């Protein structure tokens, strides 16, 4: 391999350098924004508790104030 050893080693070295470049060049950057995760709850109406107000008396009408 008197006339084969040199070009093969040259190609090997070039490939190694290209690989190192392709890695390290792309390592830089790659973090421009931060996006937080979202964890919401299910908004459904199953078995809602029911509150009933009742007003009654011997009178005809009444004035009523209540808290919803």
């Amino acid at each position: 391999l008197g006339r084969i050893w040199l070009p093969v080693l040259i190609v090997v070295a070039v490939a190694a350098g290209a690989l190192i470049v392709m890695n390290v060049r792309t390592v830089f950057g790659s973090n421009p924004v931060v996006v937080t995760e979202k964890t919401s709850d299910n908004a459904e109406d199953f078995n809602p508790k029911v509150v009933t107000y009742e007003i009654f008396g011997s009178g005809s009408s009444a004035v009523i104030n209540y808290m919803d």
Binding site: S40, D41, N42, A43, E44, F46, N47, P48, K49
Partner: protein
Amino acid sequence: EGEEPLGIEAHAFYDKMVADLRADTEHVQHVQDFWGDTLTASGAQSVDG
């Protein structure tokens, strides 16, 4: 999982399945039901429902 948001029939099916799971004492030992209880049902269900 359902194609449409889970409703009343889904809850009935879930309750029946939970009862039958609790029936099998040999394999199943405890089922913590959070979707059944309204206090914790929000956690057990996904956002899309």
